[PDB]
Amino acid sequence: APFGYKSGSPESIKNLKDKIQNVVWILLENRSFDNILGGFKRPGFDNPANNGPFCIPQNVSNPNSPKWCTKAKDFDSVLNDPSHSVTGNNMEFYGTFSPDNAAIASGKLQPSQQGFVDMQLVSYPKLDPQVAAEQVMGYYTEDEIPTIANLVDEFTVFNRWFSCVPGPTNPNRLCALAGTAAGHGTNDNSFDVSGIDIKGIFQVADEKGVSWKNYDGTNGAFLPDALFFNYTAKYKKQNVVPLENFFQDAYLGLLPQLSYINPSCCGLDTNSMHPTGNVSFGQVFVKQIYEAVRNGPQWDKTLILLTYDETGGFYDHVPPPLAVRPDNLTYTEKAPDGSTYTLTYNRLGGRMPTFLISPYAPKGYVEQEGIDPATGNSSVYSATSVLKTLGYLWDLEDLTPRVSHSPAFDHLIGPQLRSDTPTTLTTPHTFP
Amino acid sequence: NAPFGYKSGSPESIKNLKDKIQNVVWILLENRSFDNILGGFKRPGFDNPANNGPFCIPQNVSNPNSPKWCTKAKDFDSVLNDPSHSVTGNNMEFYGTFSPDNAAIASGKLQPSQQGFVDMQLVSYPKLDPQVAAEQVMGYYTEDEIPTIANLVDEFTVFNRWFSCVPGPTNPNRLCALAGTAAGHGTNDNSFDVSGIDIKGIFQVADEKGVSWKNYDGTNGAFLPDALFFNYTAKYKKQNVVPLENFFQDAYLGLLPQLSYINPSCCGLDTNSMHPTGNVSFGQVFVKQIYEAVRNGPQWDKTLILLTYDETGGFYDHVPPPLAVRPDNLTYTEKAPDGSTYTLTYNRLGGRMPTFLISPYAPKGYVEQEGIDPATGNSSVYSATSVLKTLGYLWDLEDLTPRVSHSPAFDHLIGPQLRSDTPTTLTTPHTFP
């Protein structure tokens, strides 16, 4: 209880309502904790800098295979996109394309986090193993990520925050916005045609009279997250606005209560951090978002929650834990070798970087595990932690059992307004 | 006198320009005059109401007893009634009649009186309250309402004698800025919507000379950005037209091309061009974003920002537009709301606009007056084609038209020593409903 009140307590919830009127919510793309935050030799950081190096085989199948270790520095532009499908995460986490689901459910089988180099070589068989290892085992240095390092120094990072599903972008974004992937396990067609029919946060907010905007930086290459939903396409297209509108609204104090920003993704000049886009470009985006809110009139009533959607197949040494099934819908996939795997959504995805950025957040703070609000036991954070906190903020019912079991971060919003937060973040620079 | 001791077009001036400037960023905001945006600066060198006003004109130029309306401090953040910027509308504004005598204009018998601006607003909005009409076109913004602009005035160079290329609307003016001629275009016709302009523009010139360029598109897809006026661009170079966010990325990272050209979003809610209905305050955050991205990235030390408007939007300005060389032989004919017919031969400029030279080599808080017509050596006003002239010096380009040939360049305002004085941020603006 960093400020004296526990999450979900009357005092914590009242302070949250009292301090926070605007939430800015951003999912960046495809990075792990050890990849982006692995260099910070600071108290609380469970990463290669403090607890490493970590070393895993190049081929999990022969005991004699060379071992590849986490090393400082990584490519600005990762040219070979690491695997982040369900079966790809299976290889990365458990070392097999289809692990025994009953051994997983019982605890007899746990992830050893050994297949990240192997998977990269399966995906890119002609790729130099050394390069494959630098790609997925590297972590960026402070000189390579000074904008991130600024947020680390001045605000709050989560050392135990995992993606909602162990698979790709859109199952995870949907789980973050609706509390369940609802059986989606790849980037299937329903995300491209506003075919998602379940209730999402955007529809909930309209039902509760919470104003919201989906700020669209996708460049038209794909639908932003709010247009996953049948509901938004039919009733609320006007709430999906150009990215430039965000900087306009934030500098001028015109932000809605819920701001949701989509970056541009994957490829030339995109800023999501998804391979092949640059870490340097992604930091410019983060710097723009922060500075527009920070030097706008709504800074003193705002919280920025900055996360990723999933870990993008980048190495992380922390085994993802089991988790409440969000619903009974399952998803089946065929693996590279023809094997078939069924996901029952009873475990999380990889551990991600997450930042809580607000003049009420503590400075240079590292949050460890939180409290499972339904059970009172210690629990890791996950993407649906946002939906749980928003529940306290705006009196929303939890959409799913996964939301109900997700720790909130209302206790990290302090009772006093900090006046030591910076007006700019350190400018990044390309590092080819 | 030549601020840094060399004259525009001289060997020293051109050598210093080429040594200091490797990147140009070129932005045309929309539809404001000098007296409107810069009218409230009581500063040496500013010819405006703050120093020389107030200026008063009649409500109805046909009534000798018409009440007068004057320039007044403060204007709407969002002016709801878009003033006339058509060719015949400008005629009414500048000359007090829809169809002025062209022989009398060409010989000097008939000079513009700048008396029709409130009259034309009421022609366009006959139910509008005259006081509101007056406030919309006659008012000027206080420094308190435009702190982002005020920041630029204090730290860099403004032009007190800078006129739009044509006394007409947006796209004839944007075309003349980019090609040295509006080539007979006098309204926003269909050629600008179908990449149907088949003359040589700066972008084609730049590809022919090895000069990299990008047109950063902030229109949101409502209309084609300026580079896509040209079938040349649509045929061969659509990949140099990129989203607005690419500019911020490129400028902060030092990846800007040699010529960056930024299109704002236009007209209507949440747009940032300053074209009426769109707020002055939204326009100022756009300007702040562009400046800060360039200023704080690795290319600031070699960049010049030229921030202008495309035309004066029908807003009041008291300075009569001078005569000018015809860029070519193409004319344009228009029916006035009169029912009368008028022919424009492009022998006179549009209204006087705000223009800013923003660079760590530009002098600080400096006010440029008249320049030198390079074809003549005589003092002349600046116009939109002053950019093409300066770019010709910078990159060894042939002047595209005689209008370009006669435009003063601003290479003499690029100094020989890098300033460390310049701000990293511009004052945030605020909405003022």
Interface of A with B in 60-79 (CB under 8 A): none
Q: Which two tokens stand for residue A200?
A: 């999402």
Question: What residue type is A169 in one-letter code?
Answer: T
Spatial distance between the Cα atoms of B132 and B75, rounded to a whole number of angstroms: 10
Could you tell me if B297 lies within 8 Å of chain A, comparing CB atoms? Answer: yes
User: Contact, A255 vs A22, CB < 8 A?
Assistant: yes
Kindly report the backbone phi and psi dihedral angles of residue B97, in degrees, each rounded to the nearest multiple of 5, phi listed first.
-160, 145
Whole-angstrom CA distances from B341 to B99, B126, B336, B344 are: 7, 22, 6, 10
Cβ count near B433 (within 10 Å): 7
Interface of B with A in 218-247 (CB under 8 A): 218, 220-221, 242-246
CA angle, residues B22, B23, B25, in degrees to nearest 5: 160
User: Contact, A341 vs A97, CB < 8 A?
Assistant: yes
User: Contact, A171 vs A181, CB < 8 A?
Assistant: yes
Could you tell me if A253 lies within 8 Å of chain B, comparing CB atoms? Answer: yes
Spatial distance between the Cα atoms of A407 and A412, rounded to a whole number of angstroms: 12
Give me the total of CB pairs closer than 8 Å, taking one residue from chain A and one from chain B: 74
Q: Is residue A5 part of a domain?
A: no
Instruction: Give the three-class secondary structure for B357.
Output: strand
The candidate with the shortest Cα–Cα distance to B346, out of B319, B316, B384, is B384
Q: Which two tokens stand for residue A196?
A: 């998602």
The candidate with the shortest Cα–Cα distance to A311, out of A155, A129, A139, A169, is A169
Q: What is the resolution of this structure in A?
A: 2.5
Q: Which two tokens stand for residue A343?
A: 């996901």
Could you tell me if A256 lies within 8 Å of chain B, comparing CB atoms? Answer: no
A351: Cα within 13 Å, side-chain hemisphere: 25
> Which of B359-372 are b and which e, b meaning 16 or more Cβ less than 10 Å from the residue's Cβ?
bbbbbeebbbeebb
User: Contact, B322 vs B106, CB < 8 A?
Assistant: no
A341: Cα within 13 Å, side-chain hemisphere: 26
> Which residues in chain B precede a discontinuity of more than 2.5 Å between C and N?
none
Place of tokens 């299937």: A188
Whole-angstrom CA distances from A3 to A406, A410, A415, B71 are: 21, 11, 8, 56
Provide the shortest C-alpha distance from residue A431 to chain B (in Å).
10
Instruction: Say how many domains are in chain A.
Output: 1
Provide the shortest C-alpha distance from residue A413 to chain B (in Å).
27
Spatial distance between the Cα atoms of B18 and B356, rounded to a whole number of angstroms: 20
Q: Is residue B399 part of a domain?
A: yes
Kindly report the backbone phi and psi dihedral angles of residue B178, in degrees, each rounded to the nearest multiple of 5, phi listed first.
-95, -25
Q: Running DSSP on this structure, what letter comes out for residue B192?
A: G
Whole-angstrom CA distances from A341 to A88, A315, A335, A356, B342 are: 11, 22, 7, 35, 77
Whole-angstrom CA distances from B11 to A248, B15, B17, B22, B411 are: 44, 6, 10, 18, 11
Cβ count near B145 (within 10 Å): 21
Could you tell me if B289 lies within 8 Å of chain A, comparing CB atoms? Answer: yes
Spatial distance between the Cα atoms of A136 and A113, rounded to a whole number of angstroms: 12
Beta bridge partners of B29: B309
Instruction: Give the three-class secondary structure for B271.
Output: coil
Could you tell me if B209 lies within 8 Å of chain A, comparing CB atoms? Answer: no
Q: Is residue B426 part of a domain?
A: no
Provide the shortest C-alpha distance from residue A287 to chain B (in Å).
10
User: Contact, A59 vs A119, CB < 8 A?
Assistant: no
CB contact (8 A) between residue A429 and residue B253 = yes
> CA dihedral defined by A179, A180, A184, A189, rounded to 10 degrees?
-30
Whole-angstrom CA distances from B210 to B205, B259, B331 are: 9, 11, 33
Q: Is residue A311 part of a domain?
A: yes
Question: What residue type is A138 in one-letter code?
Answer: G
> Which candidate from B245, B281, B424 shows the least CB-CB separation from A217?
B245
User: Contact, A182 vs A399, CB < 8 A?
Assistant: no
Q: Which two tokens stand for residue B124?
A: 């366009």
Q: Is residue B35 part of a domain?
A: yes
Instruction: Give the three-class secondary structure for B303.
Output: strand
Place of tokens 């010096």: B393
> Which structural domain range is residue A200 located in?
10-37+142-412
The candidate with the shortest Cα–Cα distance to B15, out of B414, B421, B398, is B414
Spatial distance between the Cα atoms of B219 and B234, rounded to a whole number of angstroms: 17
The candidate with the shortest Cα–Cα distance to A102, out of A328, A342, A330, is A342
Provide the shortest C-alpha distance from residue B253 to chain A (in Å).
6
Q: Mind giving me the DSSP string for A136-171?
A: HHEE--TTT-HHHHHHHHHSEEESSEE-SSSS-HHH
Provide the shortest C-alpha distance from residue A214 to chain B (in Å).
15
Instruction: Give the three-class secondary structure for B369.
Output: coil
Strands (E), A12-108: 22-28, 55-57, 67-69, 71-72
Q: Which two tokens stand for residue B227?
A: 């580079």
> Which candidate from A245, A284, A297 shows the least CB-CB separation from B249?
A284
Spatial distance between the Cα atoms of A326 and A189, rounded to a whole number of angstroms: 22
> CA dihedral defined by B150, B156, B161, B166, rounded to 10 degrees?
-80
**Minimal-distance CA residue of chain B relative to A219:** B243
Spatial distance between the Cα atoms of A323 and A402, rounded to a whole number of angstroms: 8
Spatial distance between the Cα atoms of B276 and B266, rounded to a whole number of angstroms: 9
> Which of A338-368 are b and which e, b meaning 16 or more Cβ less than 10 Å from the residue's Cβ?
eeebebebebbbbbbbbbbbbbbbbeebbbe
* Cα B79–chain centre separation: 19
CB contact (8 A) between residue B270 and residue A424 = no
Q: Mind giving me the DSSP string for A214-265?
A: EEE-STTSS--GGGGBHHHHHH-GGGEEETHHHHHHHHHT---SEEEEE---
Which of A240, A284, A295 is best to mutate for the B interface (most B CBs within 10 A)? Answer: A284
User: Contact, A294 vs A419, CB < 8 A?
Assistant: no
**Known binding-site positions of B for N-acetyl-D-glucosamine:** 270, 279
Provide the shortest C-alpha distance from residue A231 to chain B (in Å).
24
Could you tell me if A424 lies within 8 Å of chain B, comparing CB atoms? Answer: yes
> Which candidate from A219, A248, A271 shows the least CB-CB separation from B272?
A248
> CA dihedral defined by B150, B51, B407, B378, rounded to 10 degrees?
-150
Q: Running DSSP on this structure, what letter comes out for residue B239?
A: G
**Minimal-distance CA residue of chain A relative to B286:** A248
User: Contact, B80 vs B277, CB < 8 A?
Assistant: yes
Cβ contacts of B246 on chain A, cutoff 8 Å? 269
Place of tokens 């860029």: B327
Could you tell me if A431 lies within 8 Å of chain B, comparing CB atoms? Answer: no
Beta bridge partners of A304: A24, A357
> Which candidate from A241, A244, A254 shows the least CB-CB separation from B244?
A244
> Which candidate from A241, A264, A423 shows the least CB-CB separation from B270?
A241
Cβ contacts of B426 on chain A, cutoff 8 Å? none
Whole-angstrom CA distances from B138 to A271, B68, B224, B352 are: 44, 11, 32, 14
> Which residues in chain A precede a discontinuity of more than 2.5 Å between C and N?
none
Residue B185 sits in a domain of what CATH number? 3.40.720.10
Provide the shortest C-alpha distance from residue B289 to chain A (in Å).
9
ω before B54 within 30° of 0 (cis)?
Answer: yes
Residue B339 burial (C-beta neighbours within 10 Å; 0-12, 13-18, 19+): exposed
CB contact (8 A) between residue A248 and residue B285 = yes
CB contact (8 A) between residue B249 and residue A241 = no
User: Contact, A144 vs A78, CB < 8 A?
Assistant: no
Spatial distance between the Cα atoms of B387 and B383, rounded to a whole number of angstroms: 8
Spatial distance between the Cα atoms of A392 and A404, rounded to a whole number of angstroms: 12
Paired sense of beta strands B157-159 and B356-358, if any: antiparallel
Provide the shortest C-alpha distance from residue B294 to chain A (in Å).
12
Check the CA dihedral B155-B354-B276-A285 and report its sign: negative
Place of tokens 């060894």: B396
Could you tell me if B265 lies within 8 Å of chain A, comparing CB atoms? Answer: yes
Range B388-393 contact pairs with CB under 8 angstroms and sequence separation of 24 or more: B388/B177, B388/B178, B388/B180, B388/B202, B390/B17, B391/B24, B391/B202, B391/B259, B393/B9, B393/B13, B393/B14, B393/B17
User: Contact, A32 vs A70, CB < 8 A?
Assistant: no
Residue B121 burial (C-beta neighbours within 10 Å; 0-12, 13-18, 19+): buried
Q: How many secondary structure helices (H) and strands (E) does chain B include?
A: 15, 16
Question: What residue type is A353 in one-letter code?
Answer: P
Residue B18 burial (C-beta neighbours within 10 Å; 0-12, 13-18, 19+): middle
Spatial distance between the Cα atoms of B409 and B394, rounded to a whole number of angstroms: 10
Q: Is residue B309 part of a domain?
A: yes
Cβ count near A315 (within 10 Å): 30
Kindly report the backbone phi and psi dihedral angles of residue B155, in degrees, each rounded to the nearest multiple of 5, phi listed first.
-110, -10
Q: Answer yes or no: is A269 a known binding residue.
A: yes
Kindly report the backbone phi and psi dihedral angles of residue B151, in degrees, each rounded to the nearest multiple of 5, phi listed first.
-60, -40
Q: Which two tokens stand for residue A232?
A: 């938004």
Could you tell me if B202 lies within 8 Å of chain A, comparing CB atoms? Answer: no
Spatial distance between the Cα atoms of A340 and A335, rounded to a whole number of angstroms: 6
Q: Is residue B135 part of a domain?
A: no
Could you tell me if A298 lies within 8 Å of chain B, comparing CB atoms? Answer: no
The candidate with the shortest Cα–Cα distance to A214, out of A158, A164, A181, A255, is A255
Whole-angstrom CA distances from A11 to A8, A18, A85, A403 are: 8, 10, 42, 22
| Residue count (chain A) | 432
User: Contact, B125 vs B133, CB < 8 A?
Assistant: yes
The kind and range of the H/E element at B253 are helix B244-253
The kind and range of the H/E element at A308 are strand A302-308
Could you tell me if A251 lies within 8 Å of chain B, comparing CB atoms? Answer: yes
Provide the shortest C-alpha distance from residue B173 to chain A (in Å).
26
> Which candidate from B218, B249, B270 shows the least CB-CB separation from A271?
B249
Q: Which two tokens stand for residue A344?
A: 């029952």
The candidate with the shortest Cα–Cα distance to B80, out of B41, B34, B127, is B127
Cβ contacts of A285 on chain B, cutoff 8 Å? 245, 249
Cβ contacts of A253 on chain B, cutoff 8 Å? 430-431
Q: Running DSSP on this structure, what letter comes out for residue A60?
A: T
> Which candidate from A247, A271, A297 shows the least CB-CB separation from B285?
A247
Spatial distance between the Cα atoms of A342 and A324, rounded to a whole number of angstroms: 16
Which of B145, B217, B252, B265 is best to mutate for the A interface (most A CBs within 10 A)? Answer: B252
CB contact (8 A) between residue A253 and residue B289 = no
Place of tokens 């010529």: B259
Could you tell me if A375 lies within 8 Å of chain B, comparing CB atoms? Answer: no
Kindly report the backbone phi and psi dihedral angles of residue B92, in degrees, each rounded to the nearest multiple of 5, phi listed first.
-60, -40
Q: Running DSSP on this structure, what letter comes out for residue B62?
A: T
Cβ contacts of A296 on chain B, cutoff 8 Å? 428
User: Contact, B45 vs B326, CB < 8 A?
Assistant: no
Question: What residue type is A262 in one-letter code?
Answer: N
Q: Is residue B180 part of a domain?
A: yes
Annotate B119-167 with three-state secondary structure: HHHHHHCCCCCHHHHHHHHHCECCCCCCHHHHHHHHHCEEECCEECCCC
Place of tokens 């402070």: A142
CA angle, residues B262, B268, B271, in degrees to nearest 5: 35
Q: Running DSSP on this structure, what letter comes out for residue A318?
A: S
CB contact (8 A) between residue B270 and residue A245 = yes
CB contact (8 A) between residue B429 and residue A252 = yes
User: Contact, B271 vs B257, CB < 8 A?
Assistant: no
Strands (E), B259-381: 259-263, 303-309, 332-335, 341-344, 356-358, 366-368, 371-372, 379-380
Q: How far apart are the first and last CA of chain A?
A: 43
Residue B59 burial (C-beta neighbours within 10 Å; 0-12, 13-18, 19+): middle
Cβ count near B39 (within 10 Å): 31
Kindly report the backbone phi and psi dihedral angles of residue B157, in degrees, each rounded to the nearest multiple of 5, phi listed first.
-115, 130
User: Contact, B212 vs B260, CB < 8 A?
Assistant: no
Spatial distance between the Cα atoms of B359 and B364, rounded to a whole number of angstroms: 10
Spatial distance between the Cα atoms of A208 and A203, rounded to a whole number of angstroms: 9
Whole-angstrom CA distances from B127 to A105, A204, B212, B273 are: 75, 44, 50, 27
Place of tokens 């120093």: B51
Provide the shortest C-alpha distance from residue A55 to chain B (in Å).
34
> Which candidate from B218, B252, B282 shows the least CB-CB separation from A284?
B252
**Minimal-distance CA residue of chain A relative to B247:** A269
Spatial distance between the Cα atoms of B105 and B349, rounded to a whole number of angstroms: 12
Could you tell me if A284 lies within 8 Å of chain B, comparing CB atoms? Answer: yes
User: Contact, A181 vs A198, CB < 8 A?
Assistant: no
Whole-angstrom CA distances from A300 to A19, A183, A297, A307, A358 are: 8, 39, 7, 21, 8
> Which candidate from B245, B272, B296 shows the least CB-CB separation from A243?
B245
Spatial distance between the Cα atoms of B242 and B338, rounded to a whole number of angstroms: 42
